[PDB]
Amino acid sequence: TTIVGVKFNNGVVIAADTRSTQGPIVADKNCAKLHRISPKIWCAGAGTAADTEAVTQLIGSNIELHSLYTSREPRVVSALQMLKQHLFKYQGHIGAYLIVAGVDPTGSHLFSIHAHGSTDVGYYLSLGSGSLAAMAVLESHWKQDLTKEEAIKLASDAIQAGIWNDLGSGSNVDVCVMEIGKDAEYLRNYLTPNVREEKQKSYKFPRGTTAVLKESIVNICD
Amino acid sequence: MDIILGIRVQDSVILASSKAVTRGISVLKDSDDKTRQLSPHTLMSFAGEAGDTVQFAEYIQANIQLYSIREDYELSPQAVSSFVRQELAKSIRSRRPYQVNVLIGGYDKKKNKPELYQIDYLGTKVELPYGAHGYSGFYTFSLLDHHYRPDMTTEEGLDLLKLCVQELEKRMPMDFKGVIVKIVDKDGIRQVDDF
Amino acid sequence: MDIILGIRVQDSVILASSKAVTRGISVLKDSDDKTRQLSPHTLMSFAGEAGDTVQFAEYIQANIQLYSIREDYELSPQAVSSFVRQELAKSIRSRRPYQVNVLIGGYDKKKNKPELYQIDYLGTKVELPYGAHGYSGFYTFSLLDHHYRPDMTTEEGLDLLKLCVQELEKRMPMDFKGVIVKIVDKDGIRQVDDF
Amino acid sequence: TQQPIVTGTSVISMKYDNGVIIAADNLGSYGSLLRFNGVERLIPVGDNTVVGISGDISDMQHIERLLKDLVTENAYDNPLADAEEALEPSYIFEYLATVMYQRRSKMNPLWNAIIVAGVQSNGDQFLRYVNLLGVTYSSPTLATGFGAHMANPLLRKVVDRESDIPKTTVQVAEEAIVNAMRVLYYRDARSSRNFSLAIIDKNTGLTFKKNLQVENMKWDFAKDIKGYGTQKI
Amino acid sequence: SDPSSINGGIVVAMTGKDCVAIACDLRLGSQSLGVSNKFEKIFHYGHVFLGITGLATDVTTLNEMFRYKTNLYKLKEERAIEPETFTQLVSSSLYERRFGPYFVGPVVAGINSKSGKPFIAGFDLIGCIDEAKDFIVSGTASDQLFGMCESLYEPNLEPEDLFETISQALLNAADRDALSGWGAVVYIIKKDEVVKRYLKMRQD
Amino acid sequence: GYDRALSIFSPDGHIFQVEYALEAVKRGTCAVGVKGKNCVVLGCERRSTLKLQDTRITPSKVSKIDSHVVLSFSGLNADSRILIEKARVEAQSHRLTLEDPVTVEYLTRYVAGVQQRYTQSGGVR
Amino acid sequence: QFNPYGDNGGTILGIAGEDFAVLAGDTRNITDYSINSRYEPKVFDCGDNIVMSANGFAADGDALVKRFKNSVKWYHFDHNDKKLSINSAARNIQHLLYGKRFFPYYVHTIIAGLDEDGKGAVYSFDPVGSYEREQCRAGGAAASLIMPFLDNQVNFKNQYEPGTNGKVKKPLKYLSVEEVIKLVRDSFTSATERHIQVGDGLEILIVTKDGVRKEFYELKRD
Amino acid sequence: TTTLAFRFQGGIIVAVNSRATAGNWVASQTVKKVIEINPFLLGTMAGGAADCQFWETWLGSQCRLHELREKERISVAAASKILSNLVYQYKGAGLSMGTMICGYTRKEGPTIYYVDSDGTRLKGDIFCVGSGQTFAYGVLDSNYKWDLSVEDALYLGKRSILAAAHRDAYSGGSVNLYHVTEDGWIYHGNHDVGELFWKVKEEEGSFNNVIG
Amino acid sequence: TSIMAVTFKDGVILGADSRTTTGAYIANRVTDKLTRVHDKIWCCRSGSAADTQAIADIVQYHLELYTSQYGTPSTETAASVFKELCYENKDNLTAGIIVAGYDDKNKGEVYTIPLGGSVHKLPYAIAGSGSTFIYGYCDKNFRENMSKEETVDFIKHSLSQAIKWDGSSGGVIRMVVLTAAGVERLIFYPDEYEQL
Ligand SMILES: *[C@@](C)(CO)[C@](*)(O)[C@H](CC(C)C)NC(=O)[C@H](Cc1ccccc1)NC(=O)[C@H](CC(C)C)NC(=O)[C@H](CCc1ccccc1)NC(=O)CN1CCOCC1
Ligand SMILES: *[C@@](C)(CO)[C@](*)(O)[C@H](CC(C)C)NC(=O)[C@H](Cc1ccccc1)NC(=O)[C@H](CC(C)C)NC(=O)[C@H](CCc1ccccc1)NC(=O)CN1CCOCC1
Ligand SMILES: *[C@@](C)(CO)[C@](*)(O)[C@H](CC(C)C)NC(=O)[C@H](Cc1ccccc1)NC(=O)[C@H](CC(C)C)NC(=O)[C@H](CCc1ccccc1)NC(=O)CN1CCOCC1
Ligand SMILES: [Cl-]
Ligand SMILES: [Mg+2]
Ligand SMILES: [Mg+2]
Ligand SMILES: [Mg+2]
Ligand SMILES: [Mg+2]
C-alpha cells in the first residue's frame, strides 16, 4: 500500500491507493483503505488488512460510545490515544499502520500510528510500501499555507507516485477531505487512471460446452 | 499401532486391525485388539501415538455408554461419529492434542444400513465405502478401487479384505502380525476368530 | 540390507543373510542374495548403506580373483579378511567412506579349519565362533551363547540357525522375508535351497 | 562471501535530449558512522564516460584501478586510441558486467551497484546498471539504493518513457537530479549534503562538477511541531 | 505441514445478471493421497451460500458454527439472514480467532431478498473482507482461478451463460493443480430458484 | 618427465625401434599355437643351456590371464610380465563392469593396443 | 550470507501454429517491490530462425542466451554454415543447462521456431535441462495464471461439443497468427491485472519461414 | 510419477504416466517417461526429470559405442551397470533418479533392472517406481500371474498406472505402453486418463468410490 | 538519536536532535524528543519511540495524580517513577531516558536512566547512539554554573558533532530551557549548526 495525509489552510486531507495483495497476487483491485472512525475523523490504513479494519472499527465503536457519554463531538487525540495504547499492548502483532486525521472542536489534526504503538505529528505524512515514492513527491512539492485544492492535488500526486513506482500499490486513488466547519467529504475513486483496456476477444462459451453429470433443484425455502 | 482398515458392504461393516504392538526393536505383543465397542451396533478401531490411542478410545466409549444409560437409547453411527469428530477437533488446538486416527463402523438400526466413518487426528470426518489410516491406504485404496462392489455380501467383503492383507504382508516393510477382523451388522458386533 | 548372521561349527562356516530389499514403505525385492564368493573356499556376506554394499563387495571380489590368477593360488581366509579390513580402514578416513559391514566365512585348506570373521565399516576385525551385524546381534548373541557348542556338526549348526531366524521373525519389527543360507567347508561353497 | 564495510549510498542518473547526467554524494559510511567525507564515487573514463559506484568502497577502488588499467591497455599498439578506437561506454560497461558476474559466480562478489553513464561515438546516450549479482538493466532513469525508492519516482515524472527524452533539456534534467539529491539528504540516514555531479553531453562533452551542496531546504515548519500527540507546549 | 494445502480444494464465485454462481471441487486428500471424492465445500444457510476451502476440519467446524449462529439469528430476528450481514458475521467470527485462526478461505455468495442485488465476497483466514463485483476465488489453485476468471469473465452474464464460464474457470484451474479436482459442483442461484449441477471432469 | 621420441620414422618409411623389437622376438625361445576342433594347444621351447634350474618356481612360459584364456610369448621375458599384468587387470575389470568374462578377441585387442601405444608414446620403447 | 540468486520477475509465453510460432514476454524488470526498467527485452532472435527467452534470474538468463547465441556461431564454423535445427538447438541448450546442474541457471527457458518440416515448434526447459516440445507454454512469475487459460483456448481442454452429452470433445485445430496474438495479448492483460510483477509492456516475436518479426504493445504501468 | 514394468510369459510390459510436477503445480501432462535407447532396450524415468532425461540419453550413446567397438548389441546387465556405476560416482551430490532398464537379448532373455540414484541395482520380474508406485503395486500384484496373455498383460500395466494416476495427486496425464519381445520393443500407444478412466469405469464396473 | 541535558546557573537545559529512523530510512526528520511530564519536569527520549512514549505517558499520568493529592513533585520523584517502570519492565523495554527538571529549592537537576533501569544524578548527561562521538568533547568543554548563553552554545556545538558523525542523528536541534522564569523552547536549523 500507499497512504498519505496532508494538512491545509482550514483542515486536513488523506488519500490512499486501492490495491490489496496476497503475495504477488492482486486480490482486490479496488479495496477501500479509508475508514471512518467518527463522522469527521477518518483513518487511512496500511499493513495487515484485517488488523487495520478491526482496530479502526473497534476504536470507532468506543469513540461513538464516548461521544454519547460526554455529549461532545469526538477528538482526534482521543482516537489517537485509544489506537496507540491498543496497538502498544499487542507489541506490534496487530500489524496496523495508520494515518489518523480529522477535525474537532480543538481544530484540524494529522497523525500517524505504527503497529508497535508509536505516534508522529506532521503537516505531511506517508505510510505503506509506497511511502518512499510518495514522500519523495511530498518533500519535493509540499509548502506551508496550502489551499484545499492544492492539498488534494499534492495528496493524489503522492499516491500516484506509489501507484506507478511501487508494485505493492496500484489501481485507483481514494481521498477524504476534512475541512473545519464543514461536513467531511469522502471521495471514493477520486482518480481512476488504471482502467482495463477492452479485451481482444469474447470468451463467452457456446451453451452446452461443459459436460454435466447431474442436475437438481436446491431447496432454500422452509 | 499401524494398520487399520474398514470395508462397508451391503449389510455390514467390516473392520480389520493389526495385532502387533511394537516399541523400539521389539514386538512386545502380537495379539492386540485395537478397537472398542462404543455401543451394541457401533465399533471404533484406532491407531496413532502410544497411550493416546487407548486413552481416547475408552474416553469416547465411556461417554457413549453414559448417553445410552441416560436416554435408554442407542445413538446412531452418524451421531457417534460427529461426537468423536468434535472431540478430536477440540483436541487439535489443545495444549497436547490426541494423536489418534479412528475408523467408526456401525449399523444404523433406524435406516437399516451399515455406515463406515474415517476420522483422522485433526478431526477430519468422511463417510466411505472403504477406509484406511496410515500407510495401509497407499496399497489398499487402489486395490479396493479395482475389486470393490457396493452390493457385496459379508463373505465377499472378507475375501476382499483377505486380498488387502495379503498385499500388505507382501509389500509392507514392517511385520504387523496379521489382523483381528470384526463384523458390525443388524445383529450387533462379532469377531472372526480364524483369519 | 539388515540381517546377516554367521556361525562357525566343527567343519564348516554357515552364513545366513536376509532376502528383503526395502526402500521407503515398499519391499522392492524378497529374494536378494547379500553375498559374494571371493574365492572357492571364501564367502563374504554384507549389509549397510544402499549402493555401497554391492560396490564394495564386488571391488573386493575382483581384487581377490586378480590375486588368485596372478599367483595361481588361493588366499587364506585370514589373509582375505586382513585385506578387507585394511580397505575399510582406509575407507573410514576417506572423503566418503564405505558404510558397509561384512562377515567373511572361509575354510582354510592348509589348516583344515573353518573361520568366521566379523568386520564393521570402521575396519574393526574380530574372529568369532558366531557373529552378526546390525540389530540381529541383540537377539541372536544371547541365544547362541546358550545353545552353541564348538564341536557341532553342519546339521546341528543349521538347526541352531533356524532357532535364531525364528526368534528374529518373532521379535524383529521389520519383515526381512527370510534368509538365504550358505555353507562353506572343505568342498567349497554351496547353498541350502530349502530354508 | 563478503560483507561490506565502508560503504557509499545512492547513485542517481537520467537521460536528457543531448546526453546523460549522473550524481552521487561524497560520503564513505562505516555502518552508522559517517566516517569519510571526501570520497569521490563518480569516476570518469576518457572524455565520454562516467562510472558511478555505490556499495563497498574498497571494491570501488579496485574497480577504479581496473578502469584506469583498461585505458592504458587500450592505448597499447593503438594509433587511434584518442579517436575511432577510443573506449566507448558500452565497452566499459560490458567489461564491468562481465567481471561482476564472474565474481558472483565464484561466490566472491564485488559488493557494488554500478551505473555507467556516457555518450557513444554516434551520439547515442548510454545509461546502464550492473550490480554484485551481475544483473543488468537499462532505463531512462537509473538509481541505486535509496535512490531507487525515492529518486526514480521524481526523475520518472520528467522522463516517464523513451519519447520524453528529446523533450527534456539539460537545465530541467539537472534541476531534477539536484532536487532528488536534496530529498535523499532529508530521508536517507547514510547520505551527506556534499555531492558530485557529472554531465556527459554529445556537444559540450564531459562536465564534471565537484563540491556541490544541497540547498534551499525546508526546515522552518519544524518549530510548530510539538510533542507526539497531545502535548501543547 | 502447511494447513491450507494438506487437504486441498477450490471454491469460486461469480456474479451475473440478477444471479450468482458458486462452485467447488470435491476432492479431499491427505497430501498426495486422495481420500474422498464426495467432499463438498459449499453450504447454505437459508438463501445465503458459503463456500469454504482450506483445512477440512475447519471447513466442517465453521459450517457447523455458522449453522448454529444463523439458526439463532433467525429465531431472534424472525427472518433469514442476508448476504451482507452474514459476511460481517463471518468476518467477526474469524477475527475472534486472530491469534489462533481457522485455516480457511471462505466465500460468501447470494442474492439479497429485499433489494434483489447479487452479492459475493471473499475472506482471508483472519476475516478480512474482500468484496467484489465480478468474482471471488479461493483454494490451492487460486492463482489458476485468478487467471481463468480474469480472462473468461464478462459482466451481466445470463444464468445459463454464467454456468459455462464459472464451470470452465473451475475445471481448467483444477487440472493444473495436483491437490484440486476429483469432481465438481456448481450452484446457479437466481432470486427464487437454485440449480445445482455436478460436472464431469478428469479423475486424476 | 622423459619425453624423447624413441620410436620414429626413417627415410625409407620404417620405424627401426619397432623392427628391432621384432629382432628381440626372433632371438626369443620358440612358441607355437595350434588349435584343433574342440581345443587349443600352446607349445613352448625352453633352451637347454640352463641346467641346475628349479622348474617348480621358475616362471612358466604360458600364463593364465583369466580362468578361460591363456597367453604365451616370445622375446624379452621381463617385458612379457608387464603385458600379462595389464591383461589380467583388464580381465577382472571387464567382469566387474560388463558382468561377463572377456572374449579372447577383446583380450587380444587390449594387449595389442598396449603394445601399439608404446610405439608412439614419448619416453618409452 | 551472500545469496548469488535473485528474482527479476516477468513472464513469458510461447505458442506454436501450423507454419509459425510466437514467443512473447513482458518488458518489465523488477527487484522486490521496485521497478528497474519498464522496457528491458528478454526475448531474443538468436539466428537460424530461433527465438529464445530465459526468464527468472536475469543475470543467469542473459548468460545462457549469450552462450547459446555463441553456440550457434560456432556450429556454423564447425559444420560448414549448416543451419541449426530447432530440435538440435533444444538438445544443445539441455547440455548448457545441465552443465551447471550443481549450480543451476535460475531460469525457465523457452525457445520457438520452425521444425525441419516447416511446422511451428516450441520447446520449454526447466532450470537444469529437462526439455519437451509443446504446442503451448507459459513460463515465469504469472505462468500459473496464464497456462490453464492456454490449455482451455489453445488445446481446447474441458471443452466438449454442444449437445453430445459431453461424449465428443471439441476437435483440435491450428490457430491463425491473428487468433494466437489475441490470446497472447489477453493472457498478458489478465496477468498484468492480477500479478504485480507483470506489466509495462509486451513484446512478441513471430517466426515464419520469411524470418523473425516483432510486435510491441503497451501494458498497465501500476 | 508412476512407472512400472513386469516380466511375463510373453516378454516384458512397460507402462508409465506422463505428468510432471514442480511442487503442487502441474507443469506438464505429456512427458515421455520412457526413453528408447535402442530397438531392444528401454529406460523408465522417475525422480528428477533432467537427471533422468540427461543420463539416460547419455546411456544410449554409451550403448551405441559398445556395439561399434564390440560388433554386438549390449546386454541389459551391462547397460544397467553403466548407468548404476555412473550415478554411484555422483552419490551424495543430489541426483534423483529411479529408473528401470528393460530389454531382451539372446543370452539373457527378457530382463528388467531397477537402478536408482543412491546406487541400488536390482534384477527382478516386477518393479513399480515413483510417487504412486504403491497404488500401482496394489493392482498389479493382486492381478499378476506369469501365464497372462499379451492382451491381458498390456491391460494390467495400463490399469495399474490408471489406479495410481487416480489416487496419487502427482500422477496422471496419460499412459504410455510398451511391449518388449524377442524381436524387440513395440509401442502400444498413448492413452489419456481423461477418457480412459470413464471408459474403464463403465466397462469394468470399478471405481465405485467416484460419482458416476 | 542524540540527546543531552545540562544544568547551569539559572536552571537546566534539555537538548535533542529530531531524527527518527527505520533502518537507514528517516521516518521522521522533525521529531520532538523533548517531552513534558510536568510543568517544569521534562525528559529526553532515546531508544524505542513506542516504548519511550508509552513510558512518558504513564509518568505524566502518575505525576498529574501526584500533584492532585500532594502538590508539585520533585525532579527526583519524577526520575523515580521513570526508573520504576524502566527497571521492572527491563526485559520488554528499550528506553534510554534523561529526566530534567527545575525546582526553586533544588534548582536545575539532571537524572539519566539507561537501559537497565538504573538512576544516575549528574551535572549533565548525554545519551543516544550519537552521544558516543561527543564524550570526549563534552567532558573537555563542560563547566559548572555556566550562563544560559554558554550552555546553549555547549549543547549546540555538542549535538552538532553528534549529528555530524552519527547517521542515526540529524535534522534540527531542539532545546528546552527550564528556569524560574518559565519554559522556553529553542530550535536550531542545519544551516546554522552544520558550519560550526
Ligand atoms: C499494501 C498493498 C502493502 O503494504 C497495503 O499495505 C495493503 C493494505 C490495505 C489492504 C489494508 N496491505 C495488504 O494488502 C496486505 C499485505 C500484507 C500481506 C500479508 C501480511 C501482511 C500484510 N494484504 C493482506 O493483508 C491480505 C489481505 C487479503 C488478501 C484480503 N491478507 C493476506 O494476505 C493474509 C495474511 C494474513 C495474516 C495473518 C497473520 C499475520 C499477518 C497476516 N494471507 C493469507 O491469507 C495467505 N494464505 C491464503 C490462504 O489461506 C492461508 C493463508
Ligand atoms: C512424478 C510425476 C512426480 O514425482 C515423477 O517422479 C516425475 C519424473 C518425470 C517428470 C521424469 N518427477 C517430476 O516431475 C519431478 C519432481 C521433482 C521436482 C523437483 C526435484 C526433483 C523431483 N519434477 C521435476 O524434475 C521438474 C520437471 C519440470 C516440471 C519440467 N523440475 C523442477 O522442479 C525444476 C528443477 C528441479 C531441480 C532438480 C535438481 C536441482 C535443481 C532443480 N525446478 C523448478 O522448476 C523450480 N521452480 C518451479 C516453479 O517455477 C519456479 C522454479
Ligand atoms: C536514535 C535513532 C537512536 O538512539 C534515537 O534513539 C531514536 C529515538 C527517538 C525517535 C525516540 N530512536 C528511533 O528512532 C528508533 C530506533 C530504534 C529502532 C528499533 C529499536 C529501537 C530503537 N526508531 C523507532 O523506534 C522506529 C519508529 C518507527 C519508524 C515509527 N521503529 C522501528 O524501527 C520499529 C522497531 C520495532 C522494534 C523492534 C525491536 C524493539 C523495539 C521496537 N521497526 C519497524 O517498524 C520495522 N522495521 C522494519 C525493518 O526491519 C527492522 C524493523
Ligand atoms: Cl518519538
Ligand atoms: Mg488435478
Ligand atoms: Mg501489474
Ligand atoms: Mg492424481
Ligand atoms: Mg547525520
- Angle of helix B137-147 versus helix B154-171 axis, rounded to 10: 140
Domain count, chain B: 1
Is the CB of residue H162 less than 8 Å from the CB of residue H197?
A: yes
**A84 C-beta closer than 6 A to ligand 3:** no
Q: Which ligand ends up closest to the CA of A46?
A: 1
| Interface contact flag, I167 D226, Cβ < 8 Å | no
| φ, ψ dihedrals at A33, nearest 5° | -100, 0
Return d(Cα E107, Cα E88) in angstroms, integer.
12
For ligand 3, what atom is nearest to the CA of residue A114?
30
Out of D193, D225, D233, closest to residue I30 by CB: D225
CA angle (G168 as vertex; G15, H203 as ends), nearest 5: 120
Out of E95, E195, E199, closest to residue A218 by CB: E195
Probe site for chain E from A90, A218, A221 (most E CB atoms < 10 A): A218
| Interface contact flag, A205 G196, Cβ < 8 Å | no
Alpha helices, H only, chain E: 56-77, 83-95, 142-152, 159-174
For ligand 2, what atom is nearest to the CA of residue H53?
11
Nearest to A109 by CA among A29, A189, A12, A198: A12
In terms of Cβ atoms closer than 10 Å to its own Cβ (0-12, 13-18, 19+), residue I9 is middle
CA of H171 to the centre of ligand 7 (A): 5
Q: Which three cell numbers stand for residue I168?
A: 542515526
- Domain coordinates in residue numbering, chain E: 1-204
**A21 C-beta closer than 6 A to ligand 1:** yes
Structure obtained using: X-ray
Q: What CATH number corresponds to the domain at position B193? A: 3.60.20.10
Is the CB of residue B40 less than 8 Å from the CB of residue B189?
A: yes
Write the CB contacts of A1 (distance below 8 Å, at least 6 apart in sequence). Answer: A16, A17, A19, A33, A46, A47, A127, A128, A129, A130, A162, A168, A169
Q: Which three cell numbers stand for residue E165?
A: 464460464
* Segment (H or E) for B110: none
Q: Which three cell numbers stand for residue H20?
A: 510432471
Domain that holds residue H125: 1-212
CATH topology (fold) of G1-222: Glutamine Phosphoribosylpyrophosphate, subunit 1, domain 1 (3.60.20)
Other CB atoms closer than 10 Å to residue F38's CB: what's the count?
A: 5
Return d(Cα C4, Cα B193) in angstroms, integer.
36
> Is any Cβ of chain H less than 8 angstroms from the Cβ of E156?
no
Q: How far is CA H55 from the centre of its chain?
A: 16
Residue nearest to atom 11 of ligand 3 (CA): I49
Residue with cell 521389539: B26
Return d(Cα I49, Cα A118) in angstroms, integer.
6
Own/partner contacts of E140-143, CB < 8 Å, gap of 24 or more, are E140/E4, E140/E5, E140/E8, E140/E9, E140/E10, E140/E53, E140/E177, E140/E179, E140/E180, E140/H24, E141/E10, E141/E173, E141/E174, E141/E176, E141/E177, E141/E179, E141/E180, E142/A22, E142/A25, E142/E10, E142/E105, E143/A25, E143/G144, E143/G145
Nearest to E202 by CA among E185, E183, E180, E186: E183
Model resolution, angstroms: 2.7
Q: Which ligand ends up closest to the CA of H97?
A: 2
| Interface contact flag, E61 B123, Cβ < 8 Å | yes
Give the per-residue SS3 of chain G. CCCCCCCCCCEEEEEECCCCEEEEEECCEEECCEEEECCCCCCEECCCCCEEEEEECHHHHHHHHHHHHHHHHHHHHHCCCCCCCHHHHHHHHHHHHHCCCCCCCCEEEEEEEECCCCCEEEEEECCCCCEEEECEEEEECCHHHHHHHHHHHCCCCCCECCCCCCCCECCCCCCCHHHHHHHHHHHHHHHHHHECCCCCEEEEEEEECCEEEEEEEECCCC
| Amino acid identity, position A171 | S
Out of G94, G102, G144, closest to residue H54 by CB: G94
User: G165 contacts in A (CB within 8 Å)?
Assistant: 211
> Is any Cβ of chain H less than 8 angstroms from the Cβ of C50?
yes
Return d(Cα H117, Cα H96) in angstroms, integer.
5
- Taking only residues 106 to 145 of chain A, the set having a beta carbon closer than 8 angstroms to any beta carbon of chain G reads 129
Which chains touch I (3+ CB pairs under 8 A)?
A: A, D
Write the CB contacts of E82 (distance below 8 Å, at least 6 apart in sequence). Answer: E48, E110, E112, E113, E114
Q: Which of I43, I45, I48, I168 to mutate to test the pocket of ligand 3 (most atoms within 8 A of CB)?
A: I48
Nearest to D25 by CA among D33, D34, D14, D16: D34
In terms of Cβ atoms closer than 10 Å to its own Cβ (0-12, 13-18, 19+), residue G124 is buried
> Is any Cβ of chain B less than 8 angstroms from the Cβ of C112?
no
Q: How far is G10 from chain E (nearest CA, A)?
A: 15
Q: How far is H26 from chain E (nearest CA, A)?
A: 5
Return d(Cα C104, Cα C97) in angstroms, integer.
20
> Residues whose CB is under 5 A from ligand 8 (ion)?
I 163, 170
Write the CB contacts of G206 (distance below 8 Å, at least 6 apart in sequence). Answer: G20, G21, G22, G177, G181, G212, G213, G214, G215
Residue nearest to atom 32 of ligand 3 (CA): I22
Return d(Cα E120, Cα B15) in angstroms, integer.
44
CATH topology (fold) of I1-196: Glutamine Phosphoribosylpyrophosphate, subunit 1, domain 1 (3.60.20)
Nearest to E155 by CA among E12, E10, E11, E19: E19
> Is any Cβ of chain G less than 8 angstroms from the Cβ of E152?
yes
**E129 C-beta closer than 6 A to ligand 1:** no
Residue of E nearest to G165 (CA): E200
Strands D136-138 and D141-143, by their bridges, are unpaired
Instruction: Report the binding-site residues of H.
Output: 49
* Segment (H or E) for H169: none
Of the candidates D1, D7, D72, D204, the residue annotated as catalytic is D1
| Amino acid identity, position H21 | T
| Amino acid identity, position B82 | S
Is the CB of residue B99 less than 8 Å from the CB of residue B131?
A: no
Cα–Cα distance list, D151 to A159, D217, F70 (Å): 16, 16, 85
Write the CB contacts of C26 (distance below 8 Å, at least 6 apart in sequence). Answer: B171, B173, H128, H133, H134, H137
Own/partner contacts of H87-95, CB < 8 Å, gap of 24 or more, are H87/H55, H87/H115, H87/H116, H87/H117, H87/H118, H87/H119, H88/C51, H88/C55, H88/H119, H90/H117, H91/C51, H91/C96, H91/H117, H91/H118, H91/H119, H92/C96, H93/G102, H94/G102, H95/H48, H95/H51, H95/H55
User: E182 contacts in H (CB within 8 Å)?
Assistant: 210
Probe site for chain D from A139, A157, A159, A166 (most D CB atoms < 10 A): A139
**H26 C-beta closer than 6 A to ligand 2:** no
Return d(Cα I30, Cα A127) in angstroms, integer.
16
Domain count, chain A: 1
**A24 C-beta closer than 6 A to ligand 1:** no
Which chains touch A (3+ CB pairs under 8 A)?
A: D, E, G, H, I
Return d(Cα B77, Cα A144) in angstroms, integer.
76
CA of D137 to the centre of ligand 2 (A): 30
Cα–Cα distance list, C67 to C61, C62, F113, H161 (Å): 10, 9, 24, 49
Is the CB of residue B83 less than 8 Å from the CB of residue B119?
A: no
Write the CB contacts of B103 (distance below 8 Å, at least 6 apart in sequence). Answer: B4, B5, B6, B15, B44, B45, B46, B116, B117, B118, B119, B131, B132, B133
Q: How far is E168 from chain H (nearest CA, A)?
A: 16
Is the CB of residue D93 less than 8 Å from the CB of residue D131?
A: no
Residue with cell 583344515: C112
First to last CA, chain A: 45
Residue nearest to atom 17 of ligand 3 (CA): I48
DSSP code of residue A207 = T
Q: How far is CA H197 from the centre of its chain?
A: 20
Other CB atoms closer than 10 Å to residue A107's CB: what's the count?
A: 13
Domain that holds residue A198: 1-222
- Domain coordinates in residue numbering, chain G: 1-222
Residue with cell 556454423: G76
Nearest to I30 by CA among D148, D8, A110: A110
For ligand 3, what atom is nearest to the CA of residue I22?
33
Residue with cell 541395482: H121
- Domain coordinates in residue numbering, chain I: 1-196
Q: What CATH number corresponds to the domain at position A73? A: 3.60.20.10
Write the CB contacts of I61 (distance below 8 Å, at least 6 apart in sequence). Answer: none
**What class has domain E1-204?**
alpha beta
CA of B18 to the centre of ligand 4 (A): 67
DSSP code of residue C135 = G
Q: Which ligand ends up closest to the CA of A52?
A: 1
| φ, ψ dihedrals at D21, nearest 5° | -125, 145
Residue with cell 530354508: C195
Is the CB of residue G139 less than 8 Å from the CB of residue G55?
A: yes
> Is any Cβ of chain H less than 8 angstroms from the Cβ of E140?
yes
Strands D49-56 and D42-44, by their bridges, are antiparallel
Q: How far is CA B129 from the centre of its chain?
A: 13
Specify which residues D206 forms β-bridges with. D200
